Amino acid sequence: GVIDTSAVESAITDGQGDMKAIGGYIVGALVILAVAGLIYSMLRKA
Amino acid sequence: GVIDTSAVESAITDGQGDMKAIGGYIVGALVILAVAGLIYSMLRKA
Amino acid sequence: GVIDTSAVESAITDGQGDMKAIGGYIVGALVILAVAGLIYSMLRKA
Amino acid sequence: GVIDTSAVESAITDGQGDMKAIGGYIVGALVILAVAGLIYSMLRKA
Amino acid sequence: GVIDTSAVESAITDGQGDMKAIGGYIVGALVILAVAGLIYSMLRKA
Amino acid sequence: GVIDTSAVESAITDGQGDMKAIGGYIVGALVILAVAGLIYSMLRKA
Amino acid sequence: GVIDTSAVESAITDGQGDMKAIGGYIVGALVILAVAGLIYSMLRKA
Amino acid sequence: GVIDTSAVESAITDGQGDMKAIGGYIVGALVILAVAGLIYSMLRKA
Amino acid sequence: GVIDTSAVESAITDGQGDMKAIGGYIVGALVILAVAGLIYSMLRKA
Amino acid sequence: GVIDTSAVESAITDGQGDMKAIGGYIVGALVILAVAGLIYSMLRKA
């Protein structure tokens, strides 16, 4: 019921927190990747 | 009987309340996820 | 006997009343659930 | 949840670390390539 | 992660090694070519 | 990688070998040409 | 009869109390589960 | 009843404890996986 | 419960161990591939 | 788990073996190609 469903809101809140964080750090890797492929393209090219 | 069945309406009401709330916050996480995968796609891509 | 069995009809009547009512409100929750899972699917997806 | 999502940050961190490193060394090869093609161009030319 | 990404550095290292080597030997050919065209130019000329 | 890149050295080696050889024989023709034009010049002249 | 049926109200009261409590703590586990599956999804994904 | 329902809280507590722990270690594997696929992507790529 | 959840930690531990190992050896292949494509590029090129 | 993950190491090992081998023989073709284009260049030229 109602109140208990307030706590649902809470844990779901943390959960959303984490998700956006980790999803964040993966993005870190992707950036390093993406960018390393930009350098690889620089060699290919020139 | 009838009246008692009015209270059934009531608790079922709270219950529906919670459900839509929590289902809500999970959606919070999913959004952070979804979106972090959009960034991951941004690296993959570029 | 007969008449008494008319009242049986009556209480069974209320009883059917309640049942369909509560069964109703549970459906309320289920809808909120169902629907929150539709949003969760929206994140999973996109 | 929250804290666990701090560690997500951490491994994603190493991951980004590696990525930028390897992406680095590939760039090493590309440079040697690129440059060897510059010499090949020097012969073609002259 | 981190360490594994140290080995990435290593193989990428050899890879750069080879590249600059082969790119080297191709240059050998190019030189012989280039130079044989210098002789051809010597006949054309004189 | 490294070793494989030793063989690169090898084939590039033969390749340089050929190049300087053929470039050689073309020079043979050029010499005969060059020289036949020297005779043509001898007639023009005298 | 009536009064005795007041105590029925009472024990049923505690009973409802417990139920909502335990049902609570199970939810604790489920959250840890749910959430650990969210991390597992994070690896699968990225 | 009430008290007994306090212990429900307790075991459900441990249970939540474990869940988040194991869910944890699975995440360990997933990370190693995820990350090994990042290296595989590094080869594919370069 | 708690303790049992310590063992969860343990097997999940081995599991993470393996994962990072195999993910490793696949990387071995990828490197040989990647690198063989670097040689193929060397021929294409020169 | 652990041991099984030792065998992962093993097959991944063979796999890396093959890869570097085949990638090798393709290089054979590329060399013949590359080199035949060097002769074609010799005609174009002279």
Add this chain to the structure above:
Amino acid sequence: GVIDTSAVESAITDGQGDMKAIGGYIVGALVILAVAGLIYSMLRKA
């Protein structure tokens, strides 16, 4: 794996065979060309 990778060696072998052959016959044409341009040069000249 290993053995299968022996056959890779084999087909790559034929492939290298062909390549050097065809690259050969093209060279035939180039020679006829090259040489016909040497005659054209003989007319231009004299």
Add this chain to the structure above:
Amino acid sequence: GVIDTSAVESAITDGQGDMKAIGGYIVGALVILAVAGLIYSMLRKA
């Protein structure tokens, strides 16, 4: 592969055939040219 590379030999063969032929007929023109310039030189001269 091998056999297919026998046909490469064949078409390259015709190709060389043509080349030497046409290169031939151009030489025809060049001769008429060359020679007409020899007559022009005869007038200039005398």
Add this chain to the structure above:
Amino acid sequence: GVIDTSAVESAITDGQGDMKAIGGYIVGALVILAVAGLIYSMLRKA
């Protein structure tokens, strides 16, 4: 039964409403993505 099944129609109606809406906004992102990749292609190209 029948009437209750009219309300099913109703909530399913809203549900369809939302779905098409959100599915909409995701499309917004996709467009921005798609289009940003069109610009990336413009650089690659020119």
Add this chain to the structure above:
Amino acid sequence: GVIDTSAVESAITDGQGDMKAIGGYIVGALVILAVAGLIYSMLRKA
């Protein structure tokens, strides 16, 4: 018995009515979903 079993037919009838109706409206959502994923695919693609 028989007649009463005629009414069984009747309520089961409404019930089938509802079912096909609601099942209907859910389909509404699914269509909006399905279709929104078709647009998402349109962005991914182009």
Add this chain to the structure above:
Amino acid sequence: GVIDTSAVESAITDGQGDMKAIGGYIVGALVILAVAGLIYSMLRKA
């Protein structure tokens, strides 16, 4: 006794009649359900 047991046959007969009838109409609903889930699957899918 015997005859009375003939009537047992009779009412049991009607009873079987009803049963198969109602069981019938429930099947009606189930079909509408089943089938609505087939459409839901059609959206999920496409």
Add this chain to the structure above:
Amino acid sequence: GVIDTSAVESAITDGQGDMKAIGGYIVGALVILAVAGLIYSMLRKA
């Protein structure tokens, strides 16, 4: 349902926002690339 689907609109909105932004900055790089290749072409050329 409906309202919740208004928020879907909202997050999808931000999401589209980001996408077009990042897709933007990648374009920044591409421009610098594109343009650096225009200079490289200027040297090649002259």
Add this chain to the structure above:
Amino acid sequence: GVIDTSAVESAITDGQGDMKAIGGYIVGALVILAVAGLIYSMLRKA
């Protein structure tokens, strides 16, 4: 979402920075090349 997409702007910014820089230094080589071919032209010429 929005903010995260501000950081996208940032890394894409550095990325553009690098690109224009490296693209720069390649231009350095090209200039030395270009110019060395201008000297080669000076000899050819005179």
Add this chain to the structure above:
Amino acid sequence: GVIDTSAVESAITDGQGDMKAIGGYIVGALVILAVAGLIYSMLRKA
């Protein structure tokens, strides 16, 4: 990104170094050529 792009500057630097050097030595040959044609002109002339 930025720093990595500092190293781009560096290798591009060496590269420019080499280029201007080799382009240099070719000029050496060209000078010897040019000049030998000046002597050839001296004979033609006188």
Add this chain to the structure above:
Amino acid sequence: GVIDTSAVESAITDGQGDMKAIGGYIVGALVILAVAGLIYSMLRKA
């Protein structure tokens, strides 16, 4: 039993009917998609 199972045949029949129909119309979209990607390929290409 038997007969009732004849009707099973019937509804399953319609069901198969629908399925092949809808599956049909989805194919309609896919064709328009597929084909629009063929045009996109036509631009990419030319």
Add this chain to the structure above:
Amino acid sequence: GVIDTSAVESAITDGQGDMKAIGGYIVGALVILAVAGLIYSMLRKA
């Protein structure tokens, strides 16, 4: 007892009959589905 148990055999017989029949017609739908997804795959693909 025995004989009555012969009739058990009989109704169970019809029952098996129906089951295999209906299970049949559902298969009809599944085939139409399956197959429509094969066409959808044909568009996706081409």
Add this chain to the structure above:
Amino acid sequence: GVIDTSAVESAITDGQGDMKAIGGYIVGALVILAVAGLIYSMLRKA
């Protein structure tokens, strides 16, 4: 008493007979079911 209890053995015997028989034929249906679900799985799948 004893003998009468021999007949108990007898009827219980038939009874066991029937039971295993009917239980048999139900199994017939279950098999047809089970198996029809295997086909349904075949469509789902493919």
Add this chain to the structure above:
Amino acid sequence: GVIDTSAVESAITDGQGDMKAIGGYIVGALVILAVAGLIYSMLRKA
């Protein structure tokens, strides 16, 4: 079932409609692209 499957036809119809439309407008861009690359080729060329 049947009729419902007529509507499947309908929405799938719109869906095909859209698809061919959007796929259309993307083609618009591609044409502008394609064509702008034709102009770029005109400069490269002349």
Add this chain to the structure above:
Amino acid sequence: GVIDTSAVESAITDGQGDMKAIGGYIVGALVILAVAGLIYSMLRKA
């Protein structure tokens, strides 16, 4: 569906707009290039 597919038309429209614009400005550069090479040709020539 249909309408949504009208907006597809719209964004694809802008997209085509941009494309033809940028493709335009690149053409600007190409013209300046092309033309600067015409001047370079003027020096070479005269």
Add this chain to the structure above:
Amino acid sequence: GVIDTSAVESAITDGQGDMKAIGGYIVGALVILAVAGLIYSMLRKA
């Protein structure tokens, strides 16, 4: 889209700017060359 495509116009603008500038300065060299060959012609001549 549209606006973003205004910036495309802008960078393409600078790009055209540079191009015409550099193409300019190369022309400077060409003029000095051209002209130095005019002096060389003056000596040859007189």
Add this chain to the structure above:
Amino acid sequence: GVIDTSAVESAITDGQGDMKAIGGYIVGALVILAVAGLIYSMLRKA
């Protein structure tokens, strides 16, 4: 019990029979698909 469990063996036997058969024919389609994609690749390619 035992014997009845012999028949279990039997039906399970047929069942395995079918499965491998159908799984077979699906493979038929897949082959035609697979192969048609090989032709599509042949066009893409050449």
Add this chain to the structure above:
Amino acid sequence: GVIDTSAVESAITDGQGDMKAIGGYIVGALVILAVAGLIYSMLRKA
């Protein structure tokens, strides 16, 4: 009592026998299935 409970052991024994047998043959089907899906995967793939 005791002895009778020895026979319990016996029938339970057969029962276990059957179970493991049938469970066996189902596994037969599953294998054929599993494996047919492996072939389907082979087509999908290649």
Add this chain to the structure above:
Amino acid sequence: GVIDTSAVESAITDGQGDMKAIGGYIVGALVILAVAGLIYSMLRKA
């Protein structure tokens, strides 16, 4: 079971039929494409 599995063979048969057919017609397009790119190459070239 067995027979039913004969029909599996049958539908899978048609399915394979279609697949190879459609896969066919796509090949038609690819050929027209492929070939139109051969003409485009003819213009590029000459």
Add this chain to the structure above:
Amino acid sequence: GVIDTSAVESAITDGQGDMKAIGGYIVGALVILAVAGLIYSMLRKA
């Protein structure tokens, strides 16, 4: 299945139609290009 696969033939037919048409008109441009480069060659030449 079969028939549906006849329509596959049909759309694939149109598709091939278009392809060869457009591929056609691109060829139109290429011809105008090709030919304009023939005129450019006429000026270069004379």
Add this chain to the structure above:
Amino acid sequence: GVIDTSAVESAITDGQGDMKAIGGYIVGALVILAVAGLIYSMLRKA
């Protein structure tokens, strides 16, 4: 498909239009060039 492929004809038409036009104006320059070299030849000569 067909009609859409009529528009392909149309844009390809304009495209051919432009091409022949621009290719035209370049020819304008070439003529002025060609001709200015004819005057330069007039001075050289006389």
Add this chain to the structure above:
Amino acid sequence: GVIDTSAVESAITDGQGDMKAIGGYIVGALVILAVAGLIYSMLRKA
């Protein structure tokens, strides 16, 4: 009564003992399963 209820505690104690034990060993299997699916995922993947 009381004491007897102490023994209830005792057997319930053993019972809890067993339960946690067996539940344990099942977990053993699940781990082997889980983990074997992790390897299967390793092949799928790589």
Add this chain to the structure above:
Amino acid sequence: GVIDTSAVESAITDGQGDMKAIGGYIVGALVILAVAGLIYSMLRKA
């Protein structure tokens, strides 16, 4: 109870044994698959 729960340990033990074994052999297939896709990639590539 306790002891019986020792045997639970035992069968669960075998069960874990099997699981890890079979999960093993499936891995065998996956390896052959994985690896055959590595060869397919070798052809695609070269």
Add this chain to the structure above:
Amino acid sequence: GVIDTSAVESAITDGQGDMKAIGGYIVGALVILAVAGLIYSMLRKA
């Protein structure tokens, strides 16, 4: 359990057998492809 899990080993064995075989024959095609693209490259080239 154990033994049954020996047979798991067996079928998984065949399965691995097939996989490596088919994966084999696909490689056959890929080789023919790969190689036909090598010839196509031979024409492109020469």
Add this chain to the structure above:
Amino acid sequence: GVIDTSAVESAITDGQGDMKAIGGYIVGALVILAVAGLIYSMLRKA
């Protein structure tokens, strides 16, 4: 399994057959192309 995997060998066999055939005929075109460019070179030249 094994045998089925013999047929895999078979279809893969045909597939390899086709591939080498078509790859063949494309080579036909390439030869005609290649060779027509040899004639174009003959005109350019002479």
Add this chain to the structure above:
Amino acid sequence: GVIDTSAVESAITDGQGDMKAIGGYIVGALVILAVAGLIYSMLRKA
């Protein structure tokens, strides 16, 4: 597969046909060019 690969032979056949034809007509132009340059040489000369 095999037969389909006979048609590959066929279209590749036409394709080779065209190629040699067009390559032909281009040669027509080249001849007119070549020859017009022979006349230009006649004026230059005399």
Add this chain to the structure above:
Amino acid sequence: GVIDTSAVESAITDGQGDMKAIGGYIVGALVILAVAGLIYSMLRKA
């Protein structure tokens, strides 16, 4: 293909037409030149 290759013949035809025409008019100039140099020779001479 074939027919399309008839049109290749056609445009190549016009192209040859033009070429011989323009090559013609250039010859006009050359004649005027040639001849004006004949007059210049007349003055030199006398």
